[PDB]
A paper describes a structure:
In addition, cryo-EM analysis of free RavA in the presence of ADP reveals the presence of two distinct conformational states: a RavA spiral containing a single seam, equivalent to the one inside the LdcI–RavA cage, and a planar C2-symmetric ring with two nucleotide-free seams at opposite positions in the RavA hexamer. This second conformation may represent an intermediate state between the “seam up” and “seam down”-oriented RavA spirals inside the LdcI–RavA complex. 3D classification and refinement (see “Methods”) resulted in two maps (at overall resolution of 7 and 6 Å, respectively), corresponding to an open spiral with a single nucleotide-free seam and a planar C2-symmetric closed ring characterised by two nucleotide-free seams at opposite positions. These medium resolution maps are sufficient to enable the high-confidence flexible fitting of a RavA hexamer (for the spiral) or a trimer (for the C2-symmetric ring) extracted from the RavA helix generated from the crystal structure. In contrast, the C2-symmetric conformation contains only four ADP molecules bound in the active sites between subunits 1–2, 2–3, 4–5 and 5–6. The 27 Å gap between subunits 1 and 6 in the spiral conformation is much wider than the seams in the closed-ring conformation, meaning that rearrangements between subunits 1–6 and 3–4 that destroy the nucleotide-binding site are more subtle. Loss of nucleotide binding mainly results from a rigid-body rotation of RavA monomers 1 and 4, accounted by shifts of helix α3 and its preceding loop, which contains the Walker-A residues A51, K52 and S53, and helix α7, which contains residue M189. All of these residues directly interact with ADP in the intact active site interface. A comparison of the C2-symmetric closed ring conformation of RavA with the 4L-2U ClpX crystal structure reveals highly similar assemblies. Importantly, our structural comparison shows that similar rigid-body like movements between the large and small AAA+ subdomains in a single ClpX subunit, or between the large or small subdomains of adjacent RavA monomers, lie at the basis of L to U subunit conversion, resulting in an impaired nucleotide-binding site.
AAA+ ATPases of the MoxR family are ubiquitous and found in all major phyla of bacteria and archaea. They are proposed to fulfil chaperone-like functions assisting the maturation or assembly of metabolic protein complexes, and are often found in an operon upstream of a gene encoding a von Willebrand factor A (VWA) domain-containing protein. The most well-characterised representative of the MoxR family is the E. coli ATPase RavA, encoded by the ravAviaA operon, together with the VWA domain-containing protein ViaA. Remarkably, RavA and LdcI together form a 3.3 megadalton cage-like complex, consisting of two D5-symmetric decameric LdcI rings located at the top and bottom of the cage, surrounded by five RavA hexamers.
Author numbering:
A (entry chain E): 126 to 312
B (entry chain D): 3 to 87, 98 to 437, 442 to 497
The structure:
Amino acid sequence: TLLTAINERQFRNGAHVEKIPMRLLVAASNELPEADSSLEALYDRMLIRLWLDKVQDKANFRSMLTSQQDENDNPVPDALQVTDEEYERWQKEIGEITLPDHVFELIFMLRQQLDKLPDAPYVSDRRWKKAIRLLQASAFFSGRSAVAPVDLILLKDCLWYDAQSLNLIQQQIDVLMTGHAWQQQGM
Amino acid sequence: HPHLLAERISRLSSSLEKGLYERSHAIRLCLLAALSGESVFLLGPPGIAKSLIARRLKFAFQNARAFEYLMTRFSTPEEVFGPLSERLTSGYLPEAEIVFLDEIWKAGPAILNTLLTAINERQFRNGAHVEKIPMRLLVAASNELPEADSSLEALYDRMLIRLWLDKVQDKANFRSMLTSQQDENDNPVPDALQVTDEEYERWQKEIGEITLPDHVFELIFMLRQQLDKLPDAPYVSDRRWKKAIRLLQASAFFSGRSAVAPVDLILLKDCLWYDAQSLNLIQQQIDVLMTGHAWQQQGMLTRLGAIVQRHLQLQQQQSDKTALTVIRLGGIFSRRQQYQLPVNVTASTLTLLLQKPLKLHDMEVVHISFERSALEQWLSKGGEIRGKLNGIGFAQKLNLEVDSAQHLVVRDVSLQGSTLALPGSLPGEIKQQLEELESDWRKQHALFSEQQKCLFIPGDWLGRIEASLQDVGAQIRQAQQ
Ligand SMILES: Nc1ncnc2c1ncn2[C@@H]1O[C@H](COP(=O)(O)OP(=O)(O)O)[C@@H](O)[C@H]1O
């Protein structure tokens, strides 16, 4: 029933169905599912995959260990809170972002590069289509009208799926970001 | 009336392909099974629009309910069809026109015992009594393949269509797919193209009434024997061949035809295979029959060889009119150098006939094709020469020598002389048989140009049928020169 709330954004309420205004879906755990298990369907649909861990800096640990800020309060002012009308209007302008020819050459090159390496993780067509919705919105909320080549860094937390693909995705993207993104290797 | 049906079918699949690139063979295949009561299997990696095709086929009908479910190892039958109280099956599987079951090669034994009964009988156990299921299309997608000796082989043998979908490969089709603004949960099919419940029940009766020609059945008569002598051929039982007739008859019914067409056999490439090993054998055996025994491609090739053999027999019989004179040359040389004819002969792999036939290499021959690049070195420098027999085989050594009257004498094992001769510059018997064979090629090519506009036919397969028919017509035109 959780798969129908993401694609169709509805729910089987006995007889008639109703829409679900789910604006953000976050899922956390600890371990990873099996490679031949039924839990891979929900994992393949989740776009952003972040690997959070504990703190490592000594200066950032002292202020975190002694924090008087209430975690259940509202530290967001009323002037910065968005309304329901602005959320529905931004969903239409996200898909209207133009796709430059220079950005298409980088997506097709990174996709074909992962298909030749045996240890590279497989990227489906659903992962490539949903990554553009997050990439087009990254430039819309930053003051741009087209897709920028700098938005390709966000793919380092979407293409990976386990501990073996983390060291390969962050390395293959870093080569393209420092080679063909700004004509570094082309020159 | 029958010709207007092909326009509505072609216009219905055109609106369904909006937003799905490189998926024309997957949408047109699911539409034929939805209007005939068949199934379709999809194989490939998860993430190639394998679930949208199940939700898009429900828009073609006026009253159709979709159902998406993922079969797990711990799934219970009370969640797929509905829990009991007598069974709350409101909006599940027994009352759904199109159902989608993702990953079918991993369900439990209880789900497998119930899925095999809703296909052959289309019934459901509602506690005590039984009720029919109006299932019009059953699609199943997964990623891996079941075992060769397990309980999951019963469901695979009943699924007729087995498609192997994959990711996109064209660069031009990937840019428009990566930036598509068409909503996948909308209704892109007009109301005029949507069929009703009365048209679906009427088409099921007209499918079985399609006339079966005797010439079209000859293709399956020979293709069945070829898939049995090879040990690597997949085992195709009689139940698979019986269900293939319903898919072939319905393919020509929606294309404006009343009988089964030989071009409808291309759909069998996604129904006889079962794994990765059978994919390279099914697509190869069908391509040979579709480009050989289909439009009389191979049937005319073996008949053309008899005309060439008959023309060579009449040429070697009248070889006493044209001899073979070898001109001489002067110059200062220690050996007697000979020269060939100038403008009279210019071909490199020319053929030379002979009068009395001999037995060379324990076999008979009627014409010896020599090489112009090697004939000039033997007639001047000397040594040994080579030459194939009957225009085939390797260039074997022959006992070629010069004669007193400037001729070529070929000897064998019994020291038998034979003067060679070249063919002169068409008899009435050869032209009569060549005109009848050329008329059959034009009649067979007209049948392909009147049925290739079918919707359930891939586009890449049209390039091989046209290339095979042109090769037969090009070989018959060279003999009449
Ligand atoms: N080859 C393709 N061509 C066009 N669109 C595609 C393709 N593959 C996936 N999509 C799009 O991705 C979306 C999600 O597909 P999804 O249901 O995840 O596929 P699957 O069922 O194979 O995992 C669909 O709405 C579909 O439009």
